[PDB]
Amino acid sequence: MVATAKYGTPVIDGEIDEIWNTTEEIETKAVAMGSLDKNATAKVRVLWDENYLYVLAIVKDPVLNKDNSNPWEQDSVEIFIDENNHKTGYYEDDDAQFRVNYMNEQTFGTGGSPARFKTAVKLIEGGYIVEAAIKWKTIKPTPNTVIGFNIQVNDANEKGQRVGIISWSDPTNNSWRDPSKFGNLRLIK
C-alpha cells in the first residue's frame, strides 16, 4: 500500500485547516477484528514539514468508551512510523507507536514519546476528529522521502471491550511490533 502526504503546517486544534484539502485522503479498510460497516473506521489525511508529520483522522464511532484499563482497548487512534523505512520485522530505534483516545489522552508503544507527540481531539456528530503532530526523531525529511506508515482505529463498546481493530495497511494487528506491516508514505512537495 502506498500513499502521499503534501508539505504543509496545520494548526493542531481539532479544527480542519483549509490546507488538509490539498492532500489525499486514505481509508482504514484493513480489518483485523470487526467489520467496516459495524466498527470504527477513519478517513485520514497526512501532511509534513521539516520538523513534524501531521495526521488528521476523522473517526466514525457512534459509541465512545474508555472503561477498559488497557489503552488499546479504549476508543482510540494509533499512529505508526518507520522513519528509515527498513520494513524490519521488529522495532528499530527510529520506529514508533503513538496512541491517543477520544479524550485526547496519550499513551505510547515502543519508540513513542510525549516529547514528540502533540494532539487535539474534537467530538463531532457520530464520532471524533484526531489531529496530531509527530516530531521526527532520526530524519530531516526532503521531498520524495518515503517512510513506513500506518494508522489503526481501536473500537471499544459500551461494555469496555475492544470489538474492532481496523487500520490502513495491516489486517493482522501486528503493527505494534512489526514495521513490515506498515505501508509506504511518500512525502511530496
Ligand X SMILES: OC[C@H]1O[C@@H](O)[C@H](O)[C@@H](O)[C@@H]1O
Q: Is 17 in the site for Ca ion (CB under 5 A)?
A: yes
Nearer to ligand X, 47 or 132 (CB): 132
Q: Mark residues 59-98: x for contact with ligand X by CB under 6 A, - for none.
A: -------------x-----x------------------x-
Contacts of 94 (CB under 8 A, 6+ apart): 81, 82, 83, 84, 111, 137, 138, 139
Q: How far apart are CA 62 and CA 44, in angstroms?
A: 18
Nearer to ligand X, 94 or 178 (CB): 178
Please give the helix or strand (H or E) that residue 2 lies within, else none: strand 2-7
Among 31, 41, 55, 61, binds Ca ion (CB under 5 A): 61
Question: Residues 34, 166: contact at Cβ < 8 Å?
Answer: yes
| Residues that contact ligand X, how many (by CB under 6 A) | 9
**DSSP assigned state of 116:** G
Q: Choosing among Ca ion, ligand X, none, which partner's interface includes residue 95 (Cβ < 5 to 8 Å by kind)?
A: Ca ion
Q: How far apart are CA 184 and CA 50, in angstroms?
A: 18
Minimum distance of ligand X from residue 6's CB (angstroms): 27
User: In the chain, what is the straight-line distance between the N-terminal and C-terminal CA atoms, in Å?
Assistant: 20
Q: Is 109 in the site for ligand X (CB under 6 A)?
A: yes
Q: How far apart are CA 183 and CA 150, in angstroms?
A: 6
Nearer to ligand X, 7 or 176 (CB): 176
Residue for grid cell 494548526: 11
Residue numbers at the binding site for ligand X (CB under 6 A): 72, 78, 97, 109, 152, 165, 173, 175-176
Residue numbers at the binding site for Ca ion (CB under 5 A): 10-11, 13, 15, 17, 61, 63, 75, 82, 84, 86, 92, 94-95, 155
